[PDB]
Symmetry: D2
Amino acid sequence: YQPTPEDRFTFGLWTVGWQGRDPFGDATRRALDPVESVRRLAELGAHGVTFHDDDLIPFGSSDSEREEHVKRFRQALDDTGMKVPMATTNLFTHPVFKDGGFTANDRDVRRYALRKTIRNIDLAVELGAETYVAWGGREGAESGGAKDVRDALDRMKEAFDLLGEYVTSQGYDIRFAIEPKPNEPRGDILLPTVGHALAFIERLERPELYGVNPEVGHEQMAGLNFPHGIAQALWAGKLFHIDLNGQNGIKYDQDLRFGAGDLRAAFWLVDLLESAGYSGPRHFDFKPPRTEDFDGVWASAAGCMRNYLILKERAAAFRADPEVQEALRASRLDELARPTAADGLQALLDDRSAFEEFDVDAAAARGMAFERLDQLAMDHLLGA
Amino acid sequence: YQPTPEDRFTFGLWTVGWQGRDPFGDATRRALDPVESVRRLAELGAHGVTFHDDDLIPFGSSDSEREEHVKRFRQALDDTGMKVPMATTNLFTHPVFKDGGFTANDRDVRRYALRKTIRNIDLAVELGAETYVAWGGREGAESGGAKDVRDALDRMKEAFDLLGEYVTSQGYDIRFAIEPKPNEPRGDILLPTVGHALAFIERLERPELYGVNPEVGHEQMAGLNFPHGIAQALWAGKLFHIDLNGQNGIKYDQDLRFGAGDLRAAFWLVDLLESAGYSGPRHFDFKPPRTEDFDGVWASAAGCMRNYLILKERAAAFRADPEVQEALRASRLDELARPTAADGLQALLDDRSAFEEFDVDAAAARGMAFERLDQLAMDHLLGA
Amino acid sequence: YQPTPEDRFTFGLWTVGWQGRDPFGDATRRALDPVESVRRLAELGAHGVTFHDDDLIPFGSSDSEREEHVKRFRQALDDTGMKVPMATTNLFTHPVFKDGGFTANDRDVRRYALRKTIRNIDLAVELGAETYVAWGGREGAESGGAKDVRDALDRMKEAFDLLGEYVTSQGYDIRFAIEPKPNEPRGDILLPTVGHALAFIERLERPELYGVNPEVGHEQMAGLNFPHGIAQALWAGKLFHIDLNGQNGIKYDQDLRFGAGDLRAAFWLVDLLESAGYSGPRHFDFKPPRTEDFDGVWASAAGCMRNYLILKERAAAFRADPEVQEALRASRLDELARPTAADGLQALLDDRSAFEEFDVDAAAARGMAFERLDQLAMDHLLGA
Amino acid sequence: YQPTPEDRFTFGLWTVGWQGRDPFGDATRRALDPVESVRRLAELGAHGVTFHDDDLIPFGSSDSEREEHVKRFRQALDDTGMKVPMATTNLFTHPVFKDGGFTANDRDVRRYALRKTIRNIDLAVELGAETYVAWGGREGAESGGAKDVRDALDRMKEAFDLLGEYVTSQGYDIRFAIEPKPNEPRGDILLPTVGHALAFIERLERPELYGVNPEVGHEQMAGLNFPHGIAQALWAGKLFHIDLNGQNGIKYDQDLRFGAGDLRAAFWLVDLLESAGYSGPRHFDFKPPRTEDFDGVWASAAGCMRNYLILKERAAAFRADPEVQEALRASRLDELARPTAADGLQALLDDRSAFEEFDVDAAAARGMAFERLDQLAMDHLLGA
Ligand SMILES: [Mn+2]
Ligand SMILES: [Mn+2]
Ligand SMILES: [Mn+2]
Ligand SMILES: [Mn+2]
Ligand SMILES: [Mn+2]
Ligand SMILES: [Mn+2]
Ligand SMILES: [Mn+2]
Ligand SMILES: [Mn+2]
């Protein structure tokens, strides 16, 4: 279960580099030089790294400091063969963003948020990133009067439309991936789920330039089924990036290593990504727990990839097993894939087998055989 | 706080008529004749009633029994002046629907589900309903292998497209309202939130014929902010119906009377409906608790309307209060409503006040004054 | 992974016998004769069965009907070698219990609830049960004024005290196991968690006669860690029975087969039961999903036991692995087991190594190595 | 609704003094001098302040710095008439506590945690505090192997027993109040609810010296009913302190001002505290949102007290209303307060009205009238 380049595993600088600050505790680890993280991740078999502007370039850097940080980072990438497939903006840490970036009530803040973003899109392109994530962690409210959501969605559409105009005007080959989250750090976050973000994208001027960046933990913070949401994103053709991690139910954002948390959901997610032929990077947005020293940081990172690969093997074995294929037919998964009424509406209307002569009791007596199927899936997951 | 016809309060037959069966208990009340419910609701000041096919016409009725049930119902409506603004299909109670209606794995069931629906659309039109709700409570799964969600969404789009074709071919003035719910009775339900349903609608052949029917409790079962979801539905122009009730957090679907549950969310919801000028019926999908006899049934129903009207008065007083209007300006809600960059992208790019000369620390020092605003809102809610 | 008698797997009649009624759907399966369930469970390798009074004897039976039902059941038990280790009362299904049994506001109902219980304790003893469960599913409220909880806890203590007096007066070798649940079917249930039930027991007249009957799903409906709660029950010496099943987070009570739901929690639970030497039956309180016919019922039951046995093997392999034993020392689990201050208070107070000479920064630098440990646990669980 | 000294409202230094650091954001406010917070709180009508050791004395202070900080604080208290009813230890912020204080796996850390605590108990007594809170926010785990909970509970009992020995040996008039929380900052926290803490206390050597310090938000993070848990604490005689704030459901610990969050639960809590005659301080453990400047800090604090007083008036009006008193009898709350069987077990056993002649159907027909009662409560809450 040793990772390879084709596996395309990627990590945020802010993941392994998380110093361990939490709402109730100080840092437990020293800051990492992004150069060291690139080296260490490459040695573990990662394919690439991602960044927030402020992870790579200290906030408020001069042009000359900016240049030197980027230079050093590029040398590490060249030294290791690591790629930079995705970048994003930090529009959440600095106090100025306490009520939002793109949907701050203060118009001057909204404009500043756009200018910060646009500066880093230029950098992202310079580094070869083809995806630009946006997680509006500060867009939202703690109280009902603080944020008129219709006006906020107008400001959010305005901002993304301006960004689409900018990338189009520059001829850039980059697309955006909007990351939902239901809450934390705001009491409620705008675009709280995969669904709300998919729906919002359809109202943008250039919808083709935007997709979702769903995160395992975030949908689970709403008690939603993350494989189901990914399936809807896939169905819509909007899965432009994914964040992989673990989460134990409805609570604060834990960002556990991938595999931890809801293990059966991790299994079904890998099954779906691999079955659908998803071609994007398998990106980890996780935090080694603050209990850990650097050895545990690298162990946690390695474990992300290991778990993905173990689940990939098990899901593959599940789908290739003739007994599972038989069970899937027994449960009528083949029938679900066939059109209800390719014969068309009139034919349906005139088909007495769909109504007057439909034997409801005979149909109702038919078992779905879902338990046997799911125990086959469990046996495969556990290698039993 | 006495309801009037213009208030347009409506109730499902299945609401006050709920006999009190729950997962662990038998009925506590006798079945109600829909005629009696129409009479009683009218006496309380309701404007109309809604129905599932199977609430009005016992499942498996002959044509002559069908005719007589509808006749009796129409006499009660004519006797009282009650309207029937909305109808829907029961695609969840009968065993044949145990794996779904429109997304059942069995194709014969999917066709039967469409034919059942289409029959009741004809009835709904005969009774004057302009909205046709669809709550796919059985669409989903308990286990991961049981339901391929991409195939299920294909079958779901197929079904709604056929229904759109049918209403178009008949020249009917009816529109559909899809009701999300995250779970219960399936382990996970497809289209689990307002967002997922909005997104799904945009993929239908005739999107203009479909909106959402969000329910207070259902979004709350995912710990989501129901006023926020309604705001997004409004923003999209897709709020075609609403279900009002109460829910105490993330747990089974309680369907408490409106006002109960999250009271502050009820306040903010009423504020939003009234401020936006929502013109649809204020429909209650609630269940008088099984502890109650018929006197308590009618008390619970009355309480739905009373709470709506008390919250309407308080929200109106909040928005009309010059001190609140001052607080809203202090918190920059006026600024949120103004375009970020009506000057356009280039102007933004060339505006040094948005970047080089933006004083982040001065901006960050500015308080949002949201606490004073929210205590004004609380004072208004409580009449303090 | 074939079950044996020493495995002591037991099932409620109401588990495999669940006809599939849910809040939104009719039964999907016919009623099972308890005789058939005993036969079928024995063929799968179960050790015994448990019952509610009303599962074995239809409510309202005459003495002669009572005798004949018990006779038939006893013949099946004798035919199969199945045991009856536990019984309980149905104080939740009949309408009379809509506000509770022991804590109903109506005193006449409370007395009736006690008499119903006492009748079935006599039967339980006749059948050899040594544990008598009590799940007060109707004890609680939907609204705040309906139930004064201090008075309710007085009535609850009164009832259990009377039951303790009764078993003592009869010389019966039976102990009680109180089953917490946070909600459903009441909006909030009294004694909502393992903790609240442990605390309540300590106030009873004869605390030694009462323990907890925790259920996996029930603690998870509060987002609690079920292995942690079991550990506290074990620590207190109060784990008198356990209910095993699966649950996918904070939602309605799903009662999935054991292993389903939170798989990693199932692993840690089995590890704890086996490591602690728990000697009670491994009882399943689960419901085969209503999608299933009888073949799927028996498959689901078999799967409960299979998953328990697969997890037992993996946990055993984890604890026996010298590499895990090394990791556990690396993480200082050995140190957690040693007294903080067996030297006593004064010695602690006078120990400069505990304060003036304690190097906080050196201590803080020490990693806990928990990630490596947990990846060893994951590898063992998955057989990787 | 102006607060008075008899109202006994108290605040933690760390509440109004919270600088606004969250998991995703830097401080938005400068640090407050505890002297200024004492002055400002007194001007708002608070009765007193509480502290963690590290809120009053910077961690690592010399004896002379310690003395000067305490001196300044005592002058402000004397200047204002403010009291210090409660103190506590910070055993969560410093890295050394990343795996716990009293239940850290490292024994040297456990001893250090005890010595830190004991030092501040001496200070607490010097300042007149009669209650000493303990919130073990770091006691727990993110993974299953990291923490053997039985061993941890042994270490936790050891620590509290040593503290009880210490206060007894010194002749101090101080009692402990253990604060449960279900999670955050650990994945699961030991003693996660009021119930688990009540149960744990009963196993200590000197149980009379320990009670609970329940926090509104914390029980709500488990979706529990906070008034119910308080009622059980009251019933047990163990409510030694309370933390008041707001929380919007199952999510991260929000610490909103009291009244915010679940308003109806705030109503029922105040009703219960006032009806039971609770005599402890009404302590607020809340955080003004980081959106706010200092004006909003003081507004938020004022709002805590205002909401408590508005709810007190409404609850009082509810209980004094003859119509409510009539409704409470109609719902049989009087009967719930009367013994089930003061006649004793034998009498119960011989009472044919409790069994053979109990008319279940007549009893079951009786409505509980809970909806009318709850609408009276709602009308009172809203002043309608
Ligand atoms: Mn996250
Ligand atoms: Mn992410
Ligand atoms: Mn509902
Ligand atoms: Mn509804
Ligand atoms: Mn259950
Ligand atoms: Mn159970
Ligand atoms: Mn808190
Ligand atoms: Mn607290």
